[PDB]
Amino acid sequence: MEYEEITLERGNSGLGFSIAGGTDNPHIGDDPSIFITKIIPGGAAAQDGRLRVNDSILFVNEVDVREVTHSAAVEALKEAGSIVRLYVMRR
Numbered sequence: 001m002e003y004e005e006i007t008l009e010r011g012n013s014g015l016g017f018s019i020a021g022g023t024d025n026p027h028i029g030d031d032p033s034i035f036i037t038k039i040i041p042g043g044a045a046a047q048d049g050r051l052r053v054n055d056s057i058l059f060v061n062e063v064d065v066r067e068v069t070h071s072a073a074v075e076a077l078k079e080a081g082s083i084v085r086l087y088v089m090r091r
Contacts, residue, residue, distance in 0.1 A: 001056070001089040001090060001091040002089070002090050002091070003058055003087055003088065003089055003090075004055075004087070004088055004090065005085045005086065005087050005088075006045075006048070006050040006051040006085065006086045006087075006088065007048070007050065007083055007084065007085045007086075008044045008045055008048055008050070008051065008077075008080070008083065008084055008085075008086060009044045009048070009082050009083040010044060010077070010078070010080060010081065010082045010083070010084065011043060011044040011047075013040075013042075013043055014043065014044070014077070014078060015043065015044050015045055015077040015078070015080065015084070015086075016039060016040050016042075016043020016044040016045030016046050016047065016048075017036055017038065017039035017040060017043065017045035017046070017051055017053070017077070018036065018037050018038050018039075018040065018074070019034055019035060019036045019037060019057055019070070019073055019074060019077070020034075020035065020036070020037040020070055021033045021034040021035040021056060021057075021070060021073070022034045022065070022068055022069040022070025022071065022072060022073045022074075023067055023068055023069040023070070023072070024069030024070050024071055024072075025069070025070030025071075027070065032066070032067050032068070032069075033056050033089075034056060034057040034065045034068065034070065034073040035054055035055060035056035035057065035088075035089070036051070036052070036053045036054055036055045036056075036057070036088070037053060037054070038053050039051060039052075039053055051086065051088065052088075052090070054090075055088030055089060055090055056088060056089035056090075057073050057076070057086065057087065057088050057089075058087035058088060058089055059086070059087035060073070060076030060077060060079070060080050060084060060086055060087070061076075061079075061080045061081065061084045061085065061086075063076045063079070063080075
């Protein structure tokens with residue numbers, strides 16, 4: 001699994017991509033692995049074009065989502081200020 005960072009400017013609507021896989025919502029088989037599900041077109045994520053869906057989030061600015069709920073990961077993107085470098089995993 002390759003780890004890449006994505007600097008995203010949290011626009012008016014937000015970052016611009018929804019993630020699923022946290023400890024509360026096992027989007028995956030059955031683990032706290034946080035990974036994206038879909039990036040919303042017109043948002044900071046879709047406008048930037050640095051992040052890709054299904055990417056398993058690693059860090060958010062300075063937050064580790066190793067064992068955090070899907071909402072905690074989501075909240076990370078929301079708590080990343082504005083332009084935040086988000087880390088993800090891609091095997």
